[PDB]
Structures are given as C-alpha cells and as structure tokens.
Symmetry: C5
Subunit: 228 residues, 5 copies
C-alpha cells in the first residue's frame, strides 16, 4: 500500500577491529558510543535496526550496524560521524558496505521487507549481497514469475525467518541486498539449505560475502568483546 | 553542433582516492587552502577541466573521494594527477584506489548520442561511475543485430531523461572497454534507471561492470576535506 | 545431538612473538584449560599448519552446542591471550551438524566421539547450482557411488557438515587419519566419481598435524 | 625470408614498479644521477638493451613506471633487474608491481610478422603493454582454420601501420602465453586500434588480457623521477 | 614394469617460495650467509630432508625472490625444516613466505615408466619452472580408455624435448591443487618451447588452473642467492 510507496535506504556497515587500537579500559568508550546512538535515535532521521556481533563469522570482520533512513545523505552523515567522532569508529576499519533502496516487488506487491513492515528485528541475522544471472530480467516474465512463486513456496516452511530483499543497483557492486532475521541461527542455516531446492538457483551469479551474527541489546556487549 | 563535438579529442579520468586513516588529523586548515590553490591553478592553466569532486562516503570500503577531470591530451591529465599526489598534502595523505580512463569517440550507430560532458551539460548532483566490458562476441556480431540491440537499449531508458549518460571508450587505457558515468539530481533516479536497464537484450552481452563508485558532487574542496576520517 | 563446529585458522605475525614464549605458552595453556573447565566448548585439536600454505600457521578445531559459545571463546582467545593478540585471523570455517540427506548412518567423526586423527585436511565446499534440484534418486545414486569410492580407506574419518549461512560456503569437510599419505590417496581416488561433475568451489585447503598441547605449537612458530 | 631475425634469441621484460609513498622524498637530483649511471653502465656492458622507460602515472592504481629491456640471455635481465633493485636508490624506494617476460619466436604462419624491437624499429612515444592467454581450444584448432583467423586478424590492423606490434611468446616465463606491446606516436591511435581489433573472429578465442599498462616513453630518467610522488 | 620399487617409494616434495623484505638484509651479509649455509649443512648431515635446489627467481614475478626445493620421506620432516628456517635463521626471518607447493610421489595412472626426475635420482636442472595444476572436473571420471589415449598423445607431444625433465607429482589435499609440476632443463628456452608445443594436445581441453608460475635459475651455493637480494 503506502509501504510499497515509501522511500527508505538501508545500509549494512560492516567493521573490523584493529588489534591494539582499542585498549583495555573501555567504560568511557562504551558510554560515548551509546550516547552517539542515543543522539541518532532522538534526532528521528536514522533508525538503527541492530548492532551485531559478528565475532567468529569470518576473517577480517567483527561487527555490523544496520541502519535505515529516508535519505541516503542521512546515512552518509551518520556513517561519517560514527567514524570521525566516536572512539569505536576511530579504532575500527570499514570492511564492507551493503547499501540498498526499498522498492515494490516485481510480481507480488505484498512481499515487503520485514524492516519496512516495522517488525521487531530478529535476534540472529545473516546478510549478503546478490547478483542474478545475466538472462534473468529479460527472461519471459511469466517464466520468471513462476520461478519466483516456486521460490516463495519453498520458503513458507520458515515463517519464523523474516526476509528483507532490497534493490542495491548502483549502490555498490550488487543487484540486491538480502538479510534474514530469526530467533535461532539454526533456522537461518536450514532455510538457506532448503532454498537450494529451487529452479531460481539456476539464475544466480554472486551471493558473497556472507555476514552472520548476533544482535546485541546494548553497545556495551559489543565493545567489551572486541580485541583490544 | 554534433559533427564538431563528435570529432573533438577529449580524455576523461575518474581518479578515486581512499584516505589513509590517521594521516589527516584535526588540523586541516592549510590542507584545504593548499588543495584549493592547486585546483585554482588548474583552472587558470586552462588545460585540465575538473567536472567535479565527489564525496563517496558510504558507497564502499576502500574509497572515499573522486576527481573527475578532462583534458585534450592524456599527458595533461598525467601531469595534473601526478602533481596532485606529489605537491599537495591531501594527495600525500591519500592513496589511489582506482583509475577509470577514457577517450571520447563517436557512437557506432547513433551520432546524436554524446557524453553529457561533451555536450557541456551542467554536471549532476549525484554520480555513479563504473567500467564496462562487453561479451567476447559483441563486436563481431552482425552490425544490424548489434544496432537493433543498442536501439532497444536506448529506448529502455526513455523514462529517465533527467539521468545524463557518459558512455566513453576505454580500450587500452586500463583493463576495460568502456567508462560509464550517469549523473542525476537525485540518487534514487540512478538506482531506478539501472534496475530498468536490466530488462534489455544488451544484458546478454556483458562480461564485467564493477567496481561501482557512487557519490555526491561537492561545491568546494573545503566541503569534501572536512568529511574525511582523520 | 546439535553441534556447531569451527575451524579457526591463524597466521603468525613474524616479529610479534619473540622468543620469550614461555609466558605466552603458559597463558595460552591456561586459557585452554579454562575452556575445558567451563564445559561448553570442546577443543578437538590444535594443529600445526607449518608449510601447508602461505599465510596460515595454526588452526583450532573447537565444537559447541551453541554458536554464541564459540563466538565467546574465539573472542576471548583474541582478546585475553597474548598468543591471540599477536596472531592474525586467516580464515574461519563454520558449520552446523545436520543428518545426512539419504543415509542417516553417516555421522561425522566428531559426532561419533571418535579419537581425533594425527593428521587433518579441512576445506570448505560448494556444489554446482543444479545439484540440489537434480532428480533425487539421481543424487542419492551419485552420493552412494561416491561413498563406495572410499571403501579402501576405513582409517580416514570423514566430517561432512552443513555450512550454509555461516560464511561463504555450503559444506565444511574435514578428513582425519593417522598418516597424511592416506588423506592424499583418498582425495585422489575420490576424483574418480560422478559427484565431481557437480562442484563449484573447494578451496582453501588447510592441512596439518595435531599437536599434544599448546607448547608444541607455539615453539614451532616464526615469532 | 627473415631467417636470421626469426632465429635470434632475445628475452624481453617489462618491469613495472610502484612508488612507495614517503620513500623518495624531495631530494632527487642525485637519485637521478645515480640511476643514469646505472643505465649507462648497462649500455656499456652491451648485454641488456633498455628500449624505454615509461611514465605510467594515471594509468592504473598501484603502478607508476616501467622499464622495458631486452637481452640475449634471461640471466642477464635477472642480474640487471636485481642490480637496479639492489644498487640504485631509485630501485630501493620502488616496489615491483608486475613483471612481463617473453622470448621472441617465429610466428606460426606468417614468418614476416616480427616484433618491432626485433626489426630494430625506433620505439614509439606511447605504449600499451598487457599479457595474453588464448582459449584452451585455440592451438588444437585445425591449423588452416587458425591461419585464416589470424590472417583476418592481421587484415583488421591494416589502417594502423603507425602502431607497431610486439607479439611475443611468454609460456613458462610467468602466468601467461604471450606478451603484447603496441607502440605509436599517438596514444589515441592505440585506443582506436584496440577498438578496431575487437571486430575479429580471433576475439572468440581469448581467456585473459589484463593487466594493462599504458604510458609515455621518457627522454631521460629526470623526466620520470621528477614526477613520482615523494 | 621395470620400476616397481621407485613407484612404491614414499617421498614428499615441497617448493617453498620466499620474498625478500626491502631494507631487512642490509649490505653486510657475510654472517647471514654463514648462518644459512650452516642451516643447510645441518640438514644434509641429519639425512632426512634433501635440498634438490635453491633457485634465484629474480625477475620472474612480483612478490617472489627465491625458492627452496626439498624432499623428505615424511611431511613432518619438511614441516620442521621449513619452520626452523623461518624461526632460526636471519635469512628466514628477513624473508616472507610467498607460496608453498606440496606434493607426494605416486605411480603414474597408466605409464608406469613415467617417474619424476627427482625420484629417478637425476642431476637437477640448471633452470626450472614450477607451477601447480588442476584438471577439468570431468578428467578422472572420464572413461579410462579415453584418458589413456589423451595422456598417450600428451607424452608423445614432448618427444623432441628429452633434455627437459618432468616432475608431475600429486598434490591432492596438500594445498589448493591436484598436481605439482616442475620442469628442469639446461636452457630456459627449452622450457618455453616445450610449454608452447604442449599447447597442441587434446589434454588442454581438460585444464582448469595452472598458475602461479615460478621460473628461475639454480644457484650453486647460498652465498650466490643471498648476494642478489635487495638489501
């Protein structure tokens, strides 16, 4: 309805820790970061959907910020302020940025990202980019439509895993930004496994890197775990 | 004045830089003054024209800003590029992430298709830049068939006259066949154009189209330098 | 039985460890002894990867019922032990044990609680795009003939575990054996299978020798 | 028919270096003088022939200059390359980016096709260098069909006699099958030649052709050293 | 079947490629040389790791400078020697590991007279090129009669190069590759010409990966190599 119509950019900002930069005394670093995110939230323009602990997912990445705003300029500004004006940003390196812009789906305008639906973020997440085969969009539309319907049917064993599938064209190297949120990580793993049993898998060119981690309740929890 | 614009010799370079963490610091006043005077010197020398400086913040890891400049001779871009790196602290505290070089040529079939910069159009507020490589079979394809595919490609862009194209040969100036830049008043227009252009036969004749660089044109070297991470 | 398994591969930073390693070893052994105490994360092995590949030197194989327990242990190792502070993370191979598609007898060696092999080869795996939608009894048949191809190698123990969404891959594989040459020969014979026609990725490989305690590993490192 | 030039043994190396920012500094006159003495020492020993030194500034990220030198025995190039890195300050403040090695051989079909440097032609003011790898099926193709494709490929270059070709085997001297270098008075003629050569059937039998290195042949070391970042 | 003992022998083979660290060696290298020579003397004396060659790779490729080719009955013996070189000699401490190619000798699938130069005890070549190799996915499951034919044509294609000595050694599970390849010859131009001629074989339709290449010159003594490196 109005949710298909609305303008929202989404960014997954993945950061890596620099060994030795952070130190051991961190209470004031914690206090300053929560203040930063507190200030963002009151300002009403950038919505932080989650801060995630990616420890142990992959080499060269440690945490991720998922934030959302009507204007990309607002994400640019928050991204820069975080890096420039928080100790946490000063001591971390940008590892990967996953940018996207919400649009109505092609065939099923009732398919909406969970964050657009305003659903509570899930405790666990996996994020990755996606690139379709070269022939996918110029394919006969009703064949693409059937494949996507079969794709959809294969997912409804996972109503507890909420999908965010968002266009990413010209916001980086990719066609789509994908994010799956669930109460338990094993359901995200099983969903990806089951979704291999679909004809849509014949129309895939890229889907890495993956970022998977745990949504923290409090930035305290992330800071205290990073390498010093 | 189409035939004269088509025969013009103009090289175009997108110079993408990344800021070295820790190199800029808190005292950037002289860096900006020194960088502004470099770009002022470029204007008065009157041979390398800067179409824009762009803030790429938030686009990708490992790129922060980009210079788009144009010259009749590539050796003049070489001199300007080398001078920026060697004789300004901004160039000294930055590293080169990627260079996209190109030389304007007439289009193969439609000689009214010319780059926005060649037409002297005002540059757009937002830009996306990326290289391009066609399929191996694209150029030996029957020319009537390639002509028809390119005409359908163009028609697919009918709803986006506010997105101005710069499609420019890049052979032998790097690893690529074409340099592409799309300029628009708002970023969402570029995203929506790219998505719509997937719905074309031309898409079956592509090999490479990354890395992408997307950002915002700044009015002043001042505005860019003060965004950068220290 | 639910288990997450992680292969955490580290690279030694030459210059970072010195040859005052005695304190570093004792501190690292204390970390590991404490993990054993807590009873959540089981270390199957520490492995000397010296000479396998550039940019890797050692690997930890540990296992837990919940992934956040591994995140905590991995993070504590890098945060609270000098060995972790002076080492770089090279690569992480994560996986979650799931019952096999057709033959429910095929269980990973670590799930059976078998003794770990002296030698190990670990690598990630990605099947062809068409593998899972292939006709099912066709895939069953290929997988059975593939299993039959390892009959001469009962001393090599398999660990084939799903890795979907825990990184960039579909499966994590780990083969354990008393002699490295048995792993080499098993891999070679496994090439003679129809399954090889349905592969997209299988690197990087990490091959190495299981050590007795941390000291035996730390004393090898370039440091 | 060109027996002697086809028979001779010459190794050819393109050595591409990157400037290490911060290493070279502001004091360059003696670095220049020492580098010219190294190069004059090479001329006088008569084993290694320096065909050109090239300013690559602005071509690609992470490359800055290139030495093209030639010698009858590869160990002579190895020694000069090592001596440059070891015993000149310029070599000590530069980083090796890429090396393209080749060995001259007669052409498969047209024994009149010989590299520009083998024919003793004067080197061109502008150059593009890149490696090449053919399709897996190329060499086993029926020879008369490969010969026809290569004849048509040569015909496609006929309007560019000013762009001189160097197509040289590279098998086992690195990761590639051929080392290609095109030299010309004008960079724009190299771009146009590369564009035109896409219009051949040989393009259907290609696996790799990057990285590209493109730049301007200098007259003297001074012109290069003075543009590098300090 | 005149080679059954050599076919059954167990020998691992590693190509260890190093990169010099600019500014680390300095210009007085006499002590580093003597220390390195001592390290290699110790290996010869201990009798477990055979050094077949040390090679000057200057000018072959960016990011590599020299290579050690050594061989042992047990991989742990190479592991120890590799670690000790890095840990206990300044030359190993001032160099970076660029690349490692590991392999384990096995009888050939069809022609059991085809054995590596190093297994046959042949004098190592003055010039070498080393690279890893990965066949097409369909290579091993293909009908054996077909693979036999292709491999027989492949060996025949090398007929004019008896002076180029092959080492085609399984590398499965010792790294990212299927084979480790090394060709040794008295003249580098002979390796270039062999490699070019070997493109004219059906086997090339069954290739997936064959880089990086390391090509260089065998040095008589450690002194010769160290003196070449950047200070």
């Amino acid at each position: 309805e109005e949710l298909n119509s609305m303008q929202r950019y989404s960014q997954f900002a993945v950061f890596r820790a620099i060994p030795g930069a952070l130190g051991s005394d961190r209470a004031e670093i914690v206090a300053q970061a929560q203040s930063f995110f507190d200030g963002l939230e009151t300002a009403g323009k950038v919505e932080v959907r989650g801060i995630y602990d990616l420890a142990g997912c992959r080499a060269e990445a440690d945490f991720m910020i998922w934030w959302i705003a009507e204007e990309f300029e607002e994400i640019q500004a928050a991204f820069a302020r975080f890096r420039r004006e928080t100790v946490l940003g000063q001591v971390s390196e940008v590892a990967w940025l996953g940018n996207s812009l919400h649009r109505p789906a092609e065939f099923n305008r009732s398919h909406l990202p969970s964050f657009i639906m305003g659903e509570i973020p899930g405790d666990w997440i996996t994020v990755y980019p996606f690139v379709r085969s070269y022939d996918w969009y110029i394919m006969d539309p009703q064949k693409r439509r059937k494949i996507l319907a079969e794709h959809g049917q294969a997912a409804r064993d996972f109503p507890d895993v909420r999908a965010n599938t968002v266009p990413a064209f010209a916001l980086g190297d990719y066609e789509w930004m994908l994010a799956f949120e669930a109460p338990r990580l094993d359901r995200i793993v099983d969903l990806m496994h089951k979704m291999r049993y679909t004809e849509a898998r014949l129309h895939v060119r890229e889907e890495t890197p993956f970022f998977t981690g745990r949504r923290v309740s409090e930035v305290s929890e992330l800071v205290n775990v990073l390498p010093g």
